[PDB]
Amino acid sequence: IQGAASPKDMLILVDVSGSVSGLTLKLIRTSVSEMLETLSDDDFVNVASFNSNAQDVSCFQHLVQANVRNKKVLKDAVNNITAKGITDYKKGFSFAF
Amino acid sequence: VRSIASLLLLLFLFIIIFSLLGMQLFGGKFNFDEMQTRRSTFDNFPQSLLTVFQILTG
Amino acid sequence: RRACISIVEWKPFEIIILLTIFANCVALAIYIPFPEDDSNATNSNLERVEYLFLIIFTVEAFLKVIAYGLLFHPNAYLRNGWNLLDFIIVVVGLFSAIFDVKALRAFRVLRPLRLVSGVPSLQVVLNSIIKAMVPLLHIALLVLFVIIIYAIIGLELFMGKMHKTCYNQEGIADVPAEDDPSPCALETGHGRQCQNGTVCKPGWDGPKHGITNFDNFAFAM
Amino acid sequence: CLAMQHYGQSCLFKIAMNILNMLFTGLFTVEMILKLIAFKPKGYFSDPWNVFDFLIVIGSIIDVILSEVNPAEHTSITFFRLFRVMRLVKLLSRGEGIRTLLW
Numbered sequence: 001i002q003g004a005a006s007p008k009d010m011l012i013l014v015d016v017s018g019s020v021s022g023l024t025l026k027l028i029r030t031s032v033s034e035m036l037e038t039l040s041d042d043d044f045v046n047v048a049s050f051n052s053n054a055q056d057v058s059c060f061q062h063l064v065q066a067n068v069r070n071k072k073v074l075k076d077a078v079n080n081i082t083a084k085g086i087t088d089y090k091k092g093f094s095f096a097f
Numbered sequence: 098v099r100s101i102a103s104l105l106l107l108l109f110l111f112i113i114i115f116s117l118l119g120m121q122l123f124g125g126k127f128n129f130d131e132m133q134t135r136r137s138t139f140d141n142f143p144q145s146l147l148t149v150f151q152i153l154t155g
Numbered sequence: 156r157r158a159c160i161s162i163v164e165w166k167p168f169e170i171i172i173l174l175t176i177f178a179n180c181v182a183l184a185i186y187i188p189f190p191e192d193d194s195n196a197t198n199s200n201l202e203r204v205e206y207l208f209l210i211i212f213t214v215e216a217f218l219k220v221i222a223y224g225l226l227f228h229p230n231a232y233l234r235n236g237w238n239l240l241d242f243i244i245v246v247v248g249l250f251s252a253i254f255d256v257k258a259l260r261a262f263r264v265l266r267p268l269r270l271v272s273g274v275p276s277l278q279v280v281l282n283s284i285i286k287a288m289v290p291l292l293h294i295a296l297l298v299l300f301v302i303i304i305y306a307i308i309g310l311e312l313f314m315g316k317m318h319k320t321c322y323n324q325e326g327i328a329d330v331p332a333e334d335d336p337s338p339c340a341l342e343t344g345h346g347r348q349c350q351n352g353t354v355c356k357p358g359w360d361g362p363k364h365g366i367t368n369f370d371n372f373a374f375a376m
Numbered sequence: 377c378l379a380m381q382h383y384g385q386s387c388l389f390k391i392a393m394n395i396l397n398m399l400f401t402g403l404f405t406v407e408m409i410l411k412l413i414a415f416k417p418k419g420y421f422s423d424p425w426n427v428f429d430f431l432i433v434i435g436s437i438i439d440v441i442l443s444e445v446n447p448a449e450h451t452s453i454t455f456f457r458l459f460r461v462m463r464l465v466k467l468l469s470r471g472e473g474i475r476t477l478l479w
């Protein structure tokens with residue numbers, strides 16, 4: 001992943017809204033934590049989420065370098081997420097950008 | 098045929114009522130964290146009619 | 156004042172009210188019940204259309220009830236034709252407010268039934284079906300008695316005997332060992348014994364989610 | 377009283393159930409004695425219904441007798457219990473539509 005690409009600024013927009021309740025949420029929480037494992041130490045990441053209001057799953061509020069540690073905060077905050085409420089792509093992309 | 102059609106249409110209305118009520122009670126409530134083996138859910142109307150028919154034939 | 160309302164039913168609008176019933180059936184078909192309060196645009200529009208349908212039903216309620224009276228209008232198939240609006244009016248009286256409220260929506264599924272009220276060639280066949288149903292209540296009583304007797308016998312015999320399951324003996328994980336657990340019975344009892352590396356010990360697994368066992372009396376029925 | 381028994385049963389609950397069982401089998405045995413008084417056994421065993429009730433009564437009383445042992449402390453055949461429910465079938469005969477249809 002170092003030779004194959006240049007440093008990134010990832011920003012995962014998990015969709016924790018009502019319609020992902022159930023199995024779709026178990027795959028989102030798994031797949032997010034399976035994507036934070038493709039981040040080096042010289043590329044940043046944050047994990048937002050939106051259910052008619054876009055917030056952060058973690059306590060970071062900006063990009064956080066994806067160290068061995070910063071990832072653990074994000075992985076452990078993604079795993080403790082729950083589906084609820086309507087889905088709003090406008091307010092959740094206006095938070096990512 | 099005027100009476101076969103009437104009987105079948107009344108049956109169809111019974112199935113429609115017990116499928117609208119099916120969506121009202123069990124709409125989207127079948128999401129269990131187990132693998133999605135619930136093919137016969139009540140989610141939308143065509144998938145509710147198949148489930149009500151499957152119950153009907155038992 | 157009552158004369159115009161009375162001559163309204165002379166005009167064949169009953170077709171338009173039946174078309175309102177059909178439009179209500181179609182408005183209910185398109186409504187997708189998303190799992191946890193989620194919704195799309197279509198479900199948002201259908202609520203405004205639903206306020207429209209409550210309006211067009213309450214109006215005809217006034218018209219048909221003033222021209223036939225409080226003691227004669229309900230004295231027909233029309234009872235639910237009012238009942239259905241009454242509670243659904245309450246739905247508005249609660250929907251703007253916000254609980255147990257969303258489930259109250261279920262009443263609106265009885266509106267298709269009002270359709271068989273409109274056309275008589277279906278009312279006659281429905282009455283035929285119900286009239287044929289009436290003689291079977293003796294069979295229904297016999298089946299009720301059979302269920303009662305056999306549930307009581309099951310209670311006498313199968314009284315909570317379906318819980319000891321085949322857990323793993325090594326003891327680290329107390330999840331039942333088998334992929335599809337089946338109620339076992341430890342030694343000194345009959346039935347099935349576990350394999351070479353497990354223990355048939357109590358718990359709660361037995362049957363599926365404890366829904367189909369014989370413990371209680373409402374489980375036995 | 378045959379219907380309330382439920383897995384997860386209180387120790388006092390079983391005792392109350394047994395007291396009620398003794399009371400009810402006693403009333404049915406009193407029925408039996410009174411009916412035998414009303415007409416001698418030569419006039420009793422004509423009706424199959426009374427024979428059926430006699431079997432139910434004797435099974436219940438023998439079960440009460442065998443309850444003397446304590447296989448499970450308040451902390452062995454079960455067959456004669458099943459007579460107690462079976463008496464309910466007699467109640468079914470009250471209706472005449474049911475009686476004629478099944479007959």
Ligand SMILES: CCCCCCCCCCCCCCCC
Pocket residue numbers: 177178181182196197200201204
């Ligand atoms: C008799 C014809 C009935 C057809 C449907 C009537 C109600 C439809 C209203 C909403 C339609 C869905 C689109 C919502 C706007 C994007």
Ligand SMILES: CCCCCCCCCCCCCCCC
Pocket residue numbers: 301304465469475478479
């Ligand atoms: C445990 C099985 C319960 C079902 C019993 C079947 C019918 C029992 C009653 C039969 C007698 C009917 C009337 C007799 C009149 C002489």
Ligand SMILES: *[C@@H]1O[C@H](CO)[C@@H](O)[C@H](O)[C@H]1NC(C)=O
Pocket residue numbers: 080081
């Ligand atoms: C998980 O999220 C909920 C959301 O309110 C919070 O109350 C809880 O403390 C969180 N638990 C952990 C272990 O992060």
